[PDB]
C-alpha cells in the first residue's frame, strides 16, 4: 500500500546557520479514518543520530488526503553541525489528544539515501535558495531504524 507523498522546501543560510523547512503539501495520503479520510498534520523533528533536538508541527487540516500547508519553520544549525543533523518529517492523522497515528515518514540529512540525500545535497550546493522536492513517505518504524545508520 502507498502511504503518500510529501513536498517540502529546504533552505540553508551558512553565514547565519539558519535552516528553513517549508512544508508545502502532501498528496495521495493513506486513509486512516474508518469510513472516512484522514486529518493530516506534519511534524518536523530536528535530530542528531536519531536523538531528539527540536520539534515543530503544522496546523491540522481536516478530512483530506491532499492537504495544502505552505507553512514555514526555521532551525538554528551552525555551519559546523549541518552534516551531523537529520530533518525528520512525519505525516500524522489527528484523531484524539496525545495519541500519535503516523501515516508515513521520511528524513533528509547527510546519512539519508537516494532522493532524500539528493534533496539535502542540493540544498547545500545552493546556499540561500529554497529547494523544493517531492518525497515518498515510508513506514515510521523503517525510517526510525535508518536514522541510526551513520555514514
Ligand atoms: Na531514502
From Swiss-Prot:
Residues annotated as domain C2: 2-135
PTM comment, free text: Glycosylated.
Domain notes: The first C2 domain mediates Ca(2+)-dependent phospholipid binding. The second C2 domain mediates interaction with SV2A and probably with STN2.
Lineage: Eukaryota, Metazoa, Chordata, Craniata, Vertebrata
Top-level taxon of origin: Eukaryota
Family named by the database record: Belongs to the synaptotagmin family.
Gene this protein is translated from: Syt1
UniProt modified residues of type Phosphoserine: 72, 74
Portion of the full sequence shown: 271 to 421 of 421
Protein name listed in UniProt: Synaptotagmin-1
Tissue expression remark: Expressed in the brain and adrenal medulla (at protein level).
